[PDB]
Amino acid sequence: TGALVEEEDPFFKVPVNKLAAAVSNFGYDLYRVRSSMSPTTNVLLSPLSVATALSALSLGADERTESIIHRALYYDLISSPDIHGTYKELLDTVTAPQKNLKSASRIVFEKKLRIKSSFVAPLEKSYGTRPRVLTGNPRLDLQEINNWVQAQMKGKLARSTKEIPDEISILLLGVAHFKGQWVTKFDSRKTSLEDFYLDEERTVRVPMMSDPKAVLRYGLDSDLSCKIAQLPLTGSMSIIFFLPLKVTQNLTLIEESLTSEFIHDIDRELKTVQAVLTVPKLKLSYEGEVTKSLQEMKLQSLFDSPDFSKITGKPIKLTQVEHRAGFEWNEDGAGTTHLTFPLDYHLNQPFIFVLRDTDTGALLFIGKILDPRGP
Ligand SMILES: *[C@@H]1O[C@H](CO)[C@@H](O)[C@H](O)[C@H]1NC(C)=O
């Protein structure tokens, strides 16, 4: 509907979960915009790091500009204050050691700019991050950033070398990395090269992990025309696979459904079954700019002439938003485990997976896998 009312599903009535649903819904919008731009390539995305940079920035923004941002983050549908106080919490929860997610955001400003401490104060408190002011020296500024996303990602992300843009006003950076563990490991001796249908005309061989007697939560959505399965990870997390029925690169109907609320129903409507599971080994990375995506996400106003007078007196505008993500999984797990039910779940064709946090329900990672072999 779109109007302000009180929450019903007890899950979203919790403030931190409510905030996670908004930020996550922003993630889904971004994914949909980006998937539309990359019709033939894998899409790896960890929206949280980017959503956090926007929300942090919105601190030194004024009414009109702030709203533009708040509306893209679904905050205007949250009838609760201390939205930043809650964000501090959410972050504390999903970045905890037990999870295996490392997510960081950074606001970078143009050379010689002077930032009002009234802005730095709220920012460092709620988001635990200080703004970096560019040096002007191209080689020195790029070193700084790389060392930053290095100390942050504990050196699990490829040190970039794209050379910061000549023209920079405000730069937002969102980096994230993930290497987790299933509650049940896979037999490394059961992993073999198998056929992966890239599409109806092309096939390739990628190493596939296997478990002929896997216990996962399953469900078939007749409308979307796909098979949904959920595998748990240690640290109270899960991965949801959306496997279409026929081989295809067209996953639109499905993508169009991805929302926080939709995922909550699927999570509960799922039934535990036993299945023959084969999932490809995955090790992916992505380093790009999502500025063009945000531009057609009702966020153009920020690249034009926004009002950030709460940050500085000089007119500054959102110039670029960069994202660096690294995702990976394999056999590593925690431990192991009349009349049955048949069930095949073979991920040997284009699919979409969603790494979600079980406690808050926050979207930690999303990917459209057209080719396991990676970029
Ligand atoms: C994707 O498949 C659906 C269902 O067959 C179809 O309606 C849609 O047109 C396809 N995507 C296109 C045509 O861009």
From Swiss-Prot:
GO molecular function: serine-type endopeptidase inhibitor activity
GO biological process: cellular response to cobalt ion; cellular response to dexamethasone stimulus; cellular response to glucose stimulus; cellular response to retinoic acid; epithelial cell proliferation involved in prostate gland development; kidney development; negative regulation of angiogenesis; negative regulation of endothelial cell migration
Keywords (A to Z) from UniProt: Dwarfism, Glycoprotein, Osteogenesis imperfecta, Phosphoprotein, Pyrrolidone carboxylic acid, Secreted, Signal
Record PTM: The N-terminus is blocked. Extracellular phosphorylation enhances antiangiogenic activity. N- and O-glycosylated. O-glycosylated with a core 1 or possibly core 8 glycan.
Major place of residence: secreted
Tissue expression as described in the entry: Retinal pigment epithelial cells and blood plasma.
Entries under InterPro entries matching the protein: PEDF_serpin_dom (IPR033832), Serpin_CS (IPR023795), Serpin_dom (IPR023796), Serpin_fam (IPR000215), Serpin_sf (IPR036186), Serpin_sf_1 (IPR042178), Serpin_sf_2 (IPR042185)
Location(s), subcellular: Secreted; Melanosome
ATP-binding among keywords: no
Record has Secreted as a keyword: yes
Superkingdom per UniProt: Eukaryota
Glycosylation sites recorded in the entry for this protein: 250
Residue stretches spanning the membrane: none
Residue(s) carrying Phosphoserine: 79, 192
Complexes and interactors: Interacts with PNPLA2; this interaction stimulates the phospholipase A2 activity of PNPLA2.
Similarity remark: Belongs to the serpin family.
Domain notes: The N-terminal (AA 44-121) exhibits neurite outgrowth-inducing activity. The C-terminal exposed loop (AA 382-418) is essential for serpin activity.
Connected disease: Osteogenesis imperfecta 6: A form of osteogenesis imperfecta, a disorder of bone formation characterized by low bone mass, bone fragility and susceptibility to fractures after minimal trauma. Disease severity ranges from very mild forms without fractures to intrauterine fractures and perinatal lethality. Extraskeletal manifestations, which affect a variable number of patients, are dentinogenesis imperfecta, hearing loss, and blue sclerae. OI6 is a severe, autosomal recessive form compatible with OI type III in the Sillence classification.
Its biological purpose: Neurotrophic protein; induces extensive neuronal differentiation in retinoblastoma cells. Potent inhibitor of angiogenesis. As it does not undergo the S (stressed) to R (relaxed) conformational transition characteristic of active serpins, it exhibits no serine protease inhibitory activity.
Protein's recorded name: Pigment epithelium-derived factor
Taxonomy of the source species: Eukaryota, Metazoa, Chordata, Craniata, Vertebrata
